[PDB]
Nucleic acid binder design. Structure first.
Ligand SMILES: Cc1ccnc2c1NC(=O)c1cccnc1N2C1CC1
Lengths: 412, 555
DNA sequence: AGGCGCCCGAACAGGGACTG
DNA sequence: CAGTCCCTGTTCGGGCGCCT
């Protein structure tokens, strides 16, 4: 018997009606055995045909975990509860979280099952557990408590979270604590030994305040940005000079001071691609002057809170993938490269999934926000498999791209 | 007072709306004499009531007919009430495929009678029901009433039935974990691995649990009737098949004939292996009227023939055995057509299928194969809830060469080679590096937007030039057009420099087929070469011999 | 009247390069 | 700038198949 924070769908829009996608029998078993328990505990309960709403559900194992986690795709719901969270209650984003030598991510989502949910809102949490081959119809539930992964849930539990943590923050004023959905980001410049200890210390607090918590560490101070770089060549073919000028011509959308003039004149006649052409000094000085402008920052690139983040991924071959996060073309807030992720040399989709998760993470630690991805993949390919490689409790927004390689030039 | 059978389902109205008032619409004069009485029947059974003052509600009649009836089936039209009624979460998410069912020793079918009228309507919603229909011809204006149950043709009926039924059966199933029930509409299909007689024990014992809720299960139910006929299927506990397909032999061919034709073949493809619809579907291209006259081409007839011999002998599918692995094997049928069989024990198929869909303007076999594999995986998850082990006509090196090169993320799940020609191959590869001692063709093209007139040509390191005038063309086509020239005029190894991002993009994905005859031609030359290195430079940067061929064609 | 499949066309998005 | 085109991919709407 405690209060309930009323909640409303922002004006004009309805509850999510999105269709449930087919699950593996593996995942269908894990959901049944997970939901029956959540029913017994009165977290969710069965619903009828009078409720015409659905959100998709599936299950995942977190990285290095043999236990099945239930996962709801609340993206559609979260879009329709939005004014509630952003405008109404703010979370200051620690600009320091990124500078900490270490940051651990703890799953606090369980805490959310305490609080009751506005009885009027519950009809929008409706989700179907499907059957193999359509033999039974769906088992449909709705959420009585605060559903994991909904954007209101970390919001409404805000007061309670800020409370239970206040003891710890006071004894440890230098430790930085951020919260994004089901996750709690905790970081410090402490040596890892006492860090891992201070996290357990944090584990006990929520342990004694009625929460459970199933390394997790990120190391943001070590995060590198991948700069554009022109090759180092002893001797240059026409073809080399050509690939160089073209790359430089592209890069110049980013840096206006790049010049191809003298390097261009080198190509003058119609010459064999493999013919070897010596570098004039006037060009040699132009090339060396460019390599300089490419060690600089970019005028006027800064994060604007109101605008959405956008992330682009290119497949570079042999396990490498490059990415760029930006809010406006050619102004990149970050550029990077990944290699030898799980799946390297065998499964592209696994690797891209890994990439989207690492990118989303840095994106939350940095701006406290998940990016919108442009994925170098066919819609159906991604959709058929991504659910297999998914280790995260959130779900970024994505769209599908076909961009044959002239932008492949974020890496040699 | 009436009485109270089974748990009731809350029903609202689309907020800020209320029940309908309507004028009558035509219905046949003969059958309409029967119902004047029938309403009086239901009063006594609990299915009807009335009030004079309270209903500003009226509804018309429009119905749909069914074959194979020894008596006529009534209907009422709520179309006005419907649109004004809340939406439901639909219960039918689609239907099980016969091939996904596990073999059951014993399989029975109980048919629930008065199925829709056996379910209590929501107390508070009953009101919106009032209706009127012609007496015989007519005499007096009429009378009206309200519904105490689920009306035929109401938006909410199937959904509320399905959920109540599910709700009832639930406690039985838990007490009988190893029985297996399935509900389609008002019919239930039950099956078990118990002994033939002890099974019928549970069949009545279940007819018990249903009666306890007022659900009648007659004995027209048949243990001896199976095969059961359900939605085009014939089902025996051991094996299933499509119901017999009649392929028109008609000499008269209307675009509507080919259509009905194709649809039947496509329906045949779940079971009879190797059906090809490609050439017949071509006839259908760009026709104005569905009644139009069309002749059969030799290919389309050569195809129609091969399909007929497949249907000649009958065939049957097996059922699924969770203990044994799933296997999907694909064969290339050419012309971007694909067929697959999914089996467990060799030569006994669970099901078959085609993948014919040509996706994109320019494509190749690897891509189309990758796509079929995705079609099959998706289908496999729906049906068996797992992914099959794939047997594919493609060398493990062919595939490795493709996916690791392609710019997109692409994947096939666990699969092995089956050497069953035609094998899937890459018909050419572009060099990763300039070819020493090959002629270097700088190519360009330009056309004028207004005149649709243009020229395509090239310059080489050896001094060789060419320029060809072209009529009724576009900027893109000329850039393709110049690469084409450079292929034709070059030896077995060649480097080509193009500034067309458009052109570079097509060729680099190593297409083996195209909608476009010019790209097809580029392909044919590409397959003939030993070594082709194709490079890009930015336009108008005063580059190479690119500036020169630019002058030539800009001229 | 709707569900699931196919094949086709016509509409609609959006990405670059040319018009000026 | 725009504004235009040219091209290509997706997504929707219609006709059959199987059925309510
Ligand atoms: C039409 C249908 C649809 C779905 N399942 C079944 C059936 N009927 C069967 O013929 C059937 C056959 C074999 C095994 N299960 C069957 N059953 C399941 C109920 C035992």
């Amino acid at each position: 018997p405690i209060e309930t924070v009323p909640v409303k769908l922002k004006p004009g829009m309805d509850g999510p009606k999105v269709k449930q996608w087919p699950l593996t029998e593996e995942k269908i078993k894990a959901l049944v055995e997970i939901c029956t328990e959540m029913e017994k505990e009165g977290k969710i309960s069965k619903i009828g045909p009078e409720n015409p709403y659905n959100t998709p559900v599936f299950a995942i194992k977190k990285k290095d975990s043999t236990k099945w986690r239930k996962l709801v795709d609340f993206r559609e719901l979260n879009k329709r509860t939005q004014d509630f969270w952003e405008v109404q209650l703010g979370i200051p984003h620690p600009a320091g979280l990124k500078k900490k030598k270490s940051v651990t991510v703890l799953d606090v989502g369980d805490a959310y099952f305490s609080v009751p949910l506005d009885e009027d809102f519950r009809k929008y949490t409706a989700f179907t557990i499907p059957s193999i081959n359509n033999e039974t119809p769906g088992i449909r539930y709705q959420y009585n408590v605060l559903p994991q992964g909904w954007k209101g849930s970390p919001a409404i539990f805000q007061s309670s979270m800020t409370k239970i943590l206040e003891p710890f923050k006071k004894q440890n004023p230098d430790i930085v604590i951020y919260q994004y959905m089901d996750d709690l980001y905790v970081g410090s410049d402490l040596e890892i030994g006492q860090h891992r200890t201070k996290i357990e210390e944090l584990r006990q607090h929520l342990l004694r305040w009625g929460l459970t918590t199933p390394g997790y560490e990120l190391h943001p101070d070590k995060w590198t940005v991948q700069p554009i770089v022109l090759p180092e060549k002893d001797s240059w073919t026409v073809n080399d000079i050509q690939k160089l000028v073209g790359k430089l011509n592209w890069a110049s959308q980013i840096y206006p001071g790049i010049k191809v003039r003298q390097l261009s004149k080198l190509l003058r006649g119609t010459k064999a691609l493999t013919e070897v052409i010596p570098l004039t000094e006037e060009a040699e000085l132009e090339l060396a002057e460019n390599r300089e402008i490419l060690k600089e920052p970019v005028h006027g690139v800064y994060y604007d809170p109101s605008k959405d983040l956008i992330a682009e991924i290119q497949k570079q071959g042999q396990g490498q993938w490059t990415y760029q996060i930006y809010q406006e073309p050619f102004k990149n807030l970050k550029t990077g490269k990944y290699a030898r992720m799980r799946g390297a040399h065998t499964n592209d989709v696994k690797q891209l999934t890994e990439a989207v998760q690492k990118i989303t993470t840095e994106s939350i630690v940095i701006w406290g926000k998940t990016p919108k991805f442009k994925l170098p993949i066919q819609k159906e390919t991604w959709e058929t498999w991504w659910t297999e490689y998914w280790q995260a409790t959130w779900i970024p927004e994505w769209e599908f791209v076909n961009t044959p390689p002239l932008v492949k030039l974020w890496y040699q | 007072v009436p009485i109270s059978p089974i748990e009731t389902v809350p029903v609202k109205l689309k907020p800020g709306m209320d029940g309908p008032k309507v004028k009558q619409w035509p219905l046949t004069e003969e059958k309409i004499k029967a119902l004047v009485e029938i309403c009086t029947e239901m009063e006594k059974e609990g299915k009807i009531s009335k009030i004079g003052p309270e209903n500003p509600y009226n509804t018309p009649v429009f119905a749909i007919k069914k074959k194979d009836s020894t008596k006529w089936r009534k209907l009422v039209d709520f179309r006005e009430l419907n649109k004004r009624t809340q939406d439901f979460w639909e219960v039918q998410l689609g239907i099980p495929h016969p091939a996904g069912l596990k073999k059951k020793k014993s399989v029975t079918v109980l048919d629930v009678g008065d199925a829709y009228f056996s379910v209590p309507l929501d107390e508070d919603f009953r009101k919106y029901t009032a209706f009127t229909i012609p007496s015989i011809n007519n005499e007096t204006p009429g009378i009206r009433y309200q519904y105490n149950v689920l009306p035929q043709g109401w938006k909410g009926s199937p959904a509320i039935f399905q959920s109540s039924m599910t709700k009832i059966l639930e406690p039985f199933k838990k007490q009988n974990p190893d029985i297996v029930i399935y509900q389609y509409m008002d019919d239930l299909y039950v099956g078990s691995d118990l002994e033939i007689g002890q099974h019928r024990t549970k069949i009545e014992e279940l007819r018990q649990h249903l009666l306890r809720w007022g659900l009648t299960t007659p004995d027209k139910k048949h243990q001896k009737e199976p095969p059961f006929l359900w939605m085009g299927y014939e089902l025996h506990p051991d094996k299933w098949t499509v119901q017999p397909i009649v392929l028109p032999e008609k000499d008269s061919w209307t675009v509507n004939d080919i259509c009905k034709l194709v649809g039947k073949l496509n329906w045949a493809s779940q079971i009879y292996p190797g059906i090809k619809v490609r050439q017949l579907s071509k006839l259908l291209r760009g026709t104005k009227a569905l009644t139009e006259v069309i002749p059969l081409t030799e290919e389309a007839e050569l195809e129609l023939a091969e399909n007929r011999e497949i249907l000649k002998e009958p065939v049957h599918g097996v059922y699924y055995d969770p203990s044994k692995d799933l296997i999907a094997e694909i064969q290339k049928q050419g012309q971007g057509q694909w067929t697959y069989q999914i089996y467990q024990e060799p030569f006994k198929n669970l099901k078959t299928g085609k993948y014919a869909r040509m996706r994109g303007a320019h494509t190749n076999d690897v891509k189309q194969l990758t796509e079929a594999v995705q079609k099959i995986t998706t289908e496999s998850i729906v049906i068996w809830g797992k992914t099959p082990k794939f047997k594919l006509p493609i060398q493990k090196e062919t595939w490795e060469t493709w996916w690791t090169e392609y710019w997109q993320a692409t994947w096939i799940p666990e699969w092995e080679f089956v050497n069953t020609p035609p094998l899937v191959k890459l018909w050419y590869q572009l060099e990763k590096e300039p070819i020493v001692g090959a002629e270097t063709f700088y190519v360009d093209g330009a056309a004028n937007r207004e005149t649709k007139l243009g020229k395509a040509g090239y310059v080489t390191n050896k001094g060789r030039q060419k320029v060809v005038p072209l009529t009724n063309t576009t900027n893109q086509k000329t850039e393709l057009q110049a690469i084409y020239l450079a292929l034709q005029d070059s030896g077995l190894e060649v480097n080509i420099v193009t500034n067309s991002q458009y052109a570079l993009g097509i060729i680099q994905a190593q297409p083996d087929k195209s909608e476009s005859e010019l790209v097809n031609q580029i392909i044919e030359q590409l397959i003939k070469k030993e070594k082709v290195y194709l490079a890009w430079v930015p336009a108008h940067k005063g580059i190479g011999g690119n500036e020169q061929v630019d002058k030539l064609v800009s001229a």
